[PDB]
Nucleic acid binder design. Structure first.
Lengths: 463, 463, 87, 87, 87
DNA sequence: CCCC
């Protein structure tokens, strides 16, 4: 009864067509989940799958009208939706899915279970995924040159390893890492190595991501971040030199939220998935227009203190404190990298680092202590704290400090506040941040006389 | 006669397809009212429903042509429209509908009588919808910790209970409530616990609904609450430290109407049916740039005075200005709320709260008496009273206090008004507000004699 | 901008009756803006939203229409009640 | 191919842009008649556009079509009588 | 054909422009009613446009169309009551 | 798509 309905039933039982929340159908032809908005591929799937059906069913699929009828039945059979790209522990290649937690490579129906849509763009070879090869030794030497293995560099090396390993996992990342370094220090070597390692999943973005309005009008620089697993910002137009817009804290906050606000061109949709690790390259100390408790909770830094400079200007990179170590430049490294010689060696190193840091939950951690910009706001947390349980039954001692009691609230004259705050830190070295805080957190008991609803830790610590 | 017309008649008699006022069709597949504008699901419904029809009608529905014919007949048979989501005492779940008025769980046709096009997103578990369990023990322990049952908190407990109960009503609420209180007063814990308890009907927003223009251009942030039931804005931009954007009055006027004017991206539905009680989470008393009689009917305050902190700063948490209670921070609390252990427990608690507050109609009553913003404006409702024809037989007595009688109307000189107002609200302490009120609420009998008609209570009693 | 053309399409209707709460009765009763002050009814809005007065107000409006349904129904301006026209 | 002044001083994304969608696989591009910037009123060429033109792809869509990637094989030659000026 | 004066004072390429796509193979194009620049407040004649209107192919596309190049057979005649000014 |  209705042979074509039975053909549709079998093609449905093979689980080769799925319906997504976008309304599109993702089909499995040629060992990959494909979909196309302007041209469905269900009839291509029917023609390709005609081989697995019984002998009497294969002849009915050589007519375009019958394949269109089968496609109509299949479309009317799909009601429930599914989810795509939900396994962050899997790396999708062009001919399979690699498992980071195990190391084995799956192909065909073994890669079919994970509904992976994006891909790295190149095939996977088992021969090059080995730990004994002169590409491996050369890459290890290069990485040791980039990051010294000294006891002083232990924390920096560890966090560099963690950050580079976290470019494989396909989930949201809660921090933005600063690859602080200088010219000819090897951050470009890391960029090229990572691009060669993860293929099409690596995208490089300019300054517009950092200090420009993300929403504004049209902005393709954000929509490209959809499902990419690494985002790189380079050639930063220094904010230390005046004339450039400061880093927008709201931009960093939006880029850390699991959903990214941003729209493509000629697109009716606004939401695009965010799995990207965002690493910022800089030769220069960063700055922020506004700084809030939520901000320095999403910032970590890596410092590169090794040079590869030509012998002509060696003392030019040797005779000051800013940059510490100087090695010899290598010229053929860029050509060898572009020839993708160490791609699989770097892939093996990345998987090894992930396995070393695959503790049950993967999570990046911020280290705001290494940014002098926050060094004024991470110390004022040790200086100023807000109102808490009970200062009321101790007003006898704070009165002599200059504090005044107003409607059962302890306030402070501005001059007395400055006098109490000037003791721990210099009024000139930190003076700009000082009067910035003064004008930022001043409360008006009136227009003329200003008061503050804060008491120092000093006044709390000192009886 | 015309088998396909009989099939269409039966499918109509099953009451599975309805025509909406927007010009679309809503079909009942997989126990939910789905509808798509870019792909009608009538043929999907026909194929899925072919089982209930008689034996000879079942095989006729295996051809896409005949399904299209039956769909054409069904489209011709639907003339009148229907209204969706018209019941405010219903809680829609993935596997049924919960009755807030009665408490019995519905399924099948019982949930079909009400055309609910939204769901909480999770199935309902009746095995855990009971008043006894160790999750429930922790639940009311935390509830009592957040809000004590003391006599001094009886009114606070009642009003907070009303606010937490009213987020399930599917109707427009005409007032906005503020969750006043200090930091870590249990606002975040109860917020995430309620989000878990309610599911997709809960939505979080930032501050753009309060400190930025709502209408503007395209903004999901005013359109993402289409048929939502609760909106929580947390950690307002504290008004103690000057430098933050003030709350817009026009936005609040926009938000409180039955029909919220506003359009989504590429959507012309400017009639946003709001079923949510907008709850405001703040750290200081609210401030409004513009104040009039419209505010006091739409403002209510909920106060919390708790704290959570580590034992390292226990003494510091117990030795500062303005908390009332300090507890211990829990690092696993976020994971515990994420893993959804108190969902049905607080669902039962909320159904008791709603039921005890289910006196025939849900009403919300503002509490203007807690608003310092009106402390100067309610004062002109109690202390400063205009002068008019009711003072006609009052020529002599009031002229001695500093007033004069002008055409049987008593006035007050501007310098005298300044001096007298400085006695109640100091001309500098609240100088900005005094200047705003002076330039906003002054009457003119002529250009020169600009005198306020407002009369103090003290002088009228004196003969 | 004000010109003679604008003054033949403008009329105003003024309200001079305040409903004020008992707390603020003295201000409204003593205010020059209001010529008469009365009390509040809380359930009036509820019964209006119940559409209780729908047909009664329809009857009132139709009766006013019939009272003004003279063969030509034309709105007439009241230019004396605006201050920008005072000059 | 002879194209317009748009590919230099105007946004390349914009809407559908046939003035760039026709440079797909073209080995020479001549946008002549530079609008001399000595007289005030001529928009300066954006360095962003110069940077984008060198990249091996450009963004541009034809009408009633969905192909947005055009290869850049072009040798951009600009006819002029005056020195170009960038912002 | 009789075209407007967007072909003499405004950029030719811009977006869609059927004022300049209508001179495809026209053997005589007449521009009349010069917006006399004797009074300030009007756009001047761009020498860029004059040089563009002589080359054998004039850039410009119609609405809903992807054809950018038009053949220029036209003898351009400009009617004016006063002597013109060039930027 | 033009059009704003």
């Amino acid at each position: 009864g209705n042979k074509l309905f039975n053909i549709a039933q079998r093609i449905l039982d093979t689980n080769s067509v799925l319906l997504t929340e976008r309304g599109d159908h993702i089909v499995w032809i040629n060992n990959s989940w494909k979909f196309n908005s302007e041209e469905p591929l269900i009839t291509k799937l029917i023609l390709s799958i005609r081989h697995q059906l019984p002998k009497e069913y294969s002849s009915e699929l050589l007519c375009p009208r019958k394949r269109k009828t089968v496609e109509a039945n299949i479309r009317d059979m799909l009601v429930d939706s599914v989810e795509t790209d939900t396994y962050p522990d899997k790396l999708p290649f062009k001919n399979g899915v690699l498992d980071l937690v195990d190391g084995m490579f799956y192909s065909g129906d073994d890669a079919k279970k994970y509904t992976c849509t994006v891909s790295t763009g190149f095939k996977f070879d088992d021969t090059k995924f080995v730990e004994d090869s002169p590409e491996m030794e050369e890459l290890m030497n290069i990485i040791n040159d980039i990051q010294p293995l000294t006891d002083e560099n232990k924390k920096n090396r560890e966090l560099y390893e963690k950050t580079l390993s976290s470019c494989l996992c396909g989930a949201t990342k809660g921090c933005l890492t600063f690859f602080f370094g200088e010219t000819a220090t090897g951050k470009s070597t890391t960029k090229r190595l990572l691009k060669s390692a993860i293929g099409d999943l690596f995208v490089e973005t300019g300054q517009t991501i950092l200090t420009d309005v993300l929403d504004k009008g049209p902005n393709p620089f954000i929509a490209n971040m959809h499902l990419k697993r690494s985002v790189f910002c380079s050639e930063l137009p220094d904010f230390a030199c005046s004339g450039s817009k400061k880093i927008r804290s709201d931009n960093i906050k939006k880029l850390t939220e699991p959903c990214v606000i941003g729209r493509p061109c000629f697109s009716n949709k606004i939401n695009n998935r965010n799995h990207a690790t965002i690493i910022i390259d800089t030769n220069y100390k960063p700055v922020f227009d506004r700084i809030d408790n939520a901000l320095m909770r999403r910032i970590a830094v890596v410092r590169f203190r090794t040079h590869f400079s030509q012998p002509s200007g060696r003392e030019a990179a040797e005779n000051n404190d800013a940059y510490d170590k100087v090695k010899l430049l290598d010229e053929g490294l860029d050509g060898k990298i572009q020839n993708n010689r160490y791609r699989f060696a770097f892939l093996y190193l990345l998987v090894k680092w992930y396995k070393k840091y695959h503790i049950p939950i993967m999570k990046l951690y911020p280290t705001p202590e290494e940014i002098p910009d926050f060094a004024f706001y991470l110390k004022i947390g040790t200086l100023l704290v807000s109102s808490s349980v009970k200062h009321i039954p101790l007003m006898t001692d704070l009165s002599k400090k200059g504090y005044i009691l107003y409607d059962n609230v302890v306030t402070l004259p501005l001059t007395t506040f400055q006098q109490k705050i000037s003791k721990y830190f210099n009024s000139r070295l930190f003076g700009h941040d000082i009067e910035s805080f003064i004008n930022r957190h001043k409360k008006f008991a009136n227009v003329s006389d200003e008061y503050l609803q804060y008491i120092f830790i000093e006044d709390i610590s000192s009886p």
